[PDB]
Design an enzyme around this catalytic site. Structure first.
Site, PDB file in Angstrom:
ATOM      1  N   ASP A 124       0.817  -1.221   0.000  1.00  0.00           N
ATOM      2  CA  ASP A 124       0.000   0.000   0.000  1.00  0.00           C
ATOM      3  C   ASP A 124       0.852   1.273   0.000  1.00  0.00           C
ATOM      4  O   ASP A 124       0.439   2.259  -0.565  1.00  0.00           O
ATOM      5  CB  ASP A 124      -1.022   0.003   1.166  1.00  0.00           C
ATOM      6  N   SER A 125       2.044   1.235   0.609  1.00  0.00           N
ATOM      7  CA  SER A 125       2.946   2.379   0.600  1.00  0.00           C
ATOM      8  C   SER A 125       3.279   2.849  -0.829  1.00  0.00           C
ATOM      9  O   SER A 125       3.383   4.049  -1.073  1.00  0.00           O
ATOM     10  CB  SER A 125       4.217   2.044   1.372  1.00  0.00           C
ATOM     11  N   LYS A 162     -26.471 -14.847  -2.608  1.00  0.00           N
ATOM     12  CA  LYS A 162     -27.209 -13.596  -2.580  1.00  0.00           C
ATOM     13  C   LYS A 162     -26.564 -12.715  -1.524  1.00  0.00           C
ATOM     14  O   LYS A 162     -26.680 -12.974  -0.319  1.00  0.00           O
ATOM     15  CB  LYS A 162     -28.702 -13.827  -2.293  1.00  0.00           C
TER      16      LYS A 162
END
EC number: 6.5.1.2
Length: 307
Positions: free
Chosen positions: A30-31, A110
């Site tokens: 993520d960095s 569902k």
């Protein structure tokens, strides 16, 4: 100019976002994603001519507010009959088999979320509506744009209205409720209520801070699809760049359907999202046509509901 670095940043951000949010298999941490996004935000601030309708920066939300205008779907959304046991499913299957013979079923989870229609014109996401009464929903396009699992642009330039379930993953709901506890705030009752609260924000930047996803289960119009069945339509949606639910299955008969419902009754707690049932459909599209409708509902689809 800056066209080379902007196009490189779009390519890298779109690839990494898909890998993470759609495939759950990130090639970067993520960095790295956060760093590249900040760089593109900074380019678009200092050089606004590079802003595009489908820029990765759209995901962070912006100044325009969703209108919540009442808007008709291009095609009304389906209202499904319910099943509550194996006997209701045997009856559903009997009335199909008495009318059109032995057919294949598609089985799918569902999702306990908010039903949405997502309209694409020339392959670009341009309108997202809540289900509402099935005919008329609320325009929440700006908030829906913040969900990474919704493509801003498809792989082919189609004019189609897809149908999906927007939801909050269960661990993100639970972590959110922990935060709410700490500010002496009222907890959301369930992920569905939390996702509804997120999509009703006046500010898309607030929606973007919440962790939302989607699964696409159908389209309004199969004219531009080569699919001959529901299961092929979902495979085609995958190829066109949508996020679909991988736990769908094709079964030959009613025994296969009951086995699927049996499997997911035991396996539903292990899922990273809430499910409220299972949808069974006649798989072949022409056989869905042959079956037709009641006054309100397809004769070729049923929603099994968990107790």
């Amino acid at each position: 100019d800056l066209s080379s670095r902007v196009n490189e940043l779009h390519d890298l951000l779109n690839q990494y976002s898909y890998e993470y949010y759609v495939e759950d298999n990130p090639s970067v941490p993520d960095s790295e994603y956060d760093k590249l996004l900040h760089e593109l935000i900074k380019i678009e601030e200092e050089h606004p001519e590079y802003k595009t309708v489908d820029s990765p920066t759209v995901r962070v939300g912006g100044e325009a507010q969703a209108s919540f205008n009442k808007v008709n779907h291009d095609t009304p959304m389906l209202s499904l009959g319910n099943a509550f046991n194996e006997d209701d499913l045997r009856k559903f299957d009997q009335r199909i088999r008495e009318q059109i013979g032995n057919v294949e079923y598609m089985c799918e989870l569902k999702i306990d979320g908010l039903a949405v229609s997502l309209k694409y014109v020339d392959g670009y996401f341009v309108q997202g509506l809540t289900r509402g009464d099935g005919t008329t929903g609320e325009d929440i396009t700006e908030n829906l744009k913040t969900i990474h699992a919704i493509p801003l642009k498809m792989k082919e330039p189609l004019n189609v209205e897809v149908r999906g379930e927007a939801y909050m993953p269960r661990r993100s709901f639970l972590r959110l409720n922990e935060e709410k506890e700490k500010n002496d705030e009222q907890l959301f009752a369930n992920p569905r209520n939390a996702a509804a609260g997120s999509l009703r924000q006046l500010d898309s930047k607030l929606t973007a801070k919440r962790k939302l996803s989607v699964f696409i289960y159908s389209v309004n119009d199969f004219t531009d699809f080569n699919a001959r069945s529901q299961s092929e339509a979902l495979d085609e949606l995958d190829k066109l760049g949508f996020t679909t639910n991988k736990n769908r299955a094709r079964v030959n008969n009613i025994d296969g359907v009951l086995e699927y419902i049996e499997k997911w009754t035991s396996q539903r707690e292990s899922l990273p999202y809430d499910i409220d049932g299972i949808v069974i459909k006649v798989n072949d599209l022409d056989q869905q046509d042959e079956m037709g409708f009641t006054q309100k509902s397809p004769r070729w689809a049923i929603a099994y509901k968990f107790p």
